[PDB]
């Protein structure tokens, strides 16, 4: 009830929320325990091919 | 810098040569005793690089150098028991050249346990694979090859460094009465740091 016309702002914010990396934003809501775990197996992948 | 120092490689030193060589004289025909490189650099430091290209008979004849600092070779009924306070400045080399992250820390070196037990301090060169390591070391190489004899900015010249070498061997320091309780409490820390698993682990202290 407060948008009399359109602009180039209401169309750019609606295209970003449906295109972000859904596999990288799930680690922000974590502590330090599980964060250090996913990095631990990352170091083991370099030595175990 | 230090004139009491030698320089040799792995294959350049056989079984003897640097300790005490024995050979019959040609113009006397008698078993004599010839000093090596460890006897001429008394109260100094001997240098040695590439600890891989060598056999096993040379390491056995030098085991009495880092623990007893003496030479006891009696070969052919000829007694030759001397002494030399020369430190061994060894430089171990990895098996595959570089430190392998997959293998253990005891599988990349050729040194066993009796060799490292008689040896004192053991350091390892820090290897960093960051973008800031090669960016800082490259600036020192440019300033050295472009500005010849101008990159040195020392605050004390080499003439005064050699003068302060004799003052250290004058007044022998003592042990204070407030330090006997601090050494007995720090050895127990490294005792638990040694046994990472249960009893033994890697470096024995």
C-alpha distance from residue A7 to each of A4, A10, A14, A16 (Å): 10, 6, 13, 16
Structure tokens at B100: 């392998």
Structure tokens at B30: 């008698």
Structure tokens at A10: 């209401």
Residues B67, B14: contact at Cβ < 8 Å?
no
Q: How far is A24 from chain B (nearest CA, A)?
A: 24
d(CA B105, CA B92): 13
d(CA B54, CA B10): 5
Q: Which residues of A touch B (CB under 8 A)?
A: 46-48
d(CA B131, CA B135): 6
> In chain B, what residues touch A47 (CB-CB under 8 Å)?
101-102
C-alpha distance from residue B55 to each of A1, B10, B58, B113, B163 (Å): 90, 9, 6, 17, 41
Residues B96, B107: contact at Cβ < 8 Å?
no
> Facing residues of B34 across strands?
B21
- Tell the residue number behind the tokens 């050729």, with chain if given: B110
Residue B203 CA to its chain's centroid (Å):
17
> In chain A, what residues touch B101 (CB-CB under 8 Å)?
46-47
d(CA B48, CA A6): 80
C-alpha distance from residue B115 to each of A11, A29, B73, B105, B167 (Å): 73, 52, 20, 16, 34
Residues 6+ apart with CB under 8 A from B180: none
d(CA B163, CA B25): 42
Rounded to the nearest 10°, the torsion over CA B52, B57, B62, B64 is 130
Residue of A nearest to B101 (CA): A47
Residues B119, B105: contact at Cβ < 8 Å?
no
d(CA B48, CA B99): 21
Ligand-binding site membership of B93 (annotated): yes
Q: B154-189 as b/e, with b when 16 or more CB fall inside 10 Å?
A: eeeeeeeeeeeeeeeeeeeeeeeeeeeeeeeeeeee
């Amino acid at each position: 009830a407060s948008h009399p016309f359109m602009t180039a702002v209401d169309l750019m914010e609606a295209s970003q929320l449906c295109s972000m990396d859904s596999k990288a934003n799930i680690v922000h809501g974590l502590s330090v325990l599980e964060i250090c775990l996913i990095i631990a197996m990352k170091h083991l992948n370099d030595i175990y091919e | 810098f230090s004139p009491r120092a030698v320089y040799t490689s792995g294959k350049a030193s056989s079984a003897a040569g640097l300790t005490a060589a024995v050979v019959r004289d040609e113009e006397s025909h008698e078993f004599v005793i010839e000093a090596g490189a460890l006897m001429l650099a008394d109260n100094g430091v001997c240098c040695i690089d590439e600890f891989d290209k060598m056999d096993v008979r040379d390491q056995v004849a030098i085991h009495e150098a880092m623990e007893q600092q003496t030479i006891s070779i009696t070969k052919a009924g000829v007694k030759a028991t001397l002494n030399a306070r020369t430190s061994i400045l060894a430089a171990a080399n990895p098996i595959s050249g570089h430190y392998d992250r997959s293998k253990s820390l005891k599988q990349n070196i050729n040194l066993s346990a009796p060799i490292m037990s008689r040896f004192d301090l053991f350091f390892i060169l820090v290897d960093e694979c960051n973008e800031v390591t090669d960016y800082a070391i490259a600036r020192r190489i440019v300033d050295l090859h472009s500005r010849i004899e101008e990159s040195i900015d020392r605050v004390y010249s080499l003439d005064d460094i050699r003068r302060y070498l004799l003052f250290a061997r004058q007044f022998k320091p003592k042990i204070s009465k407030e330090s006997e309780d601090f050494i007995v409490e720090q050895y127990k820390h490294l005792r638990q740091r040694d046994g990472s698993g249960v009893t033994k682990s890697s470096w024995r202290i």
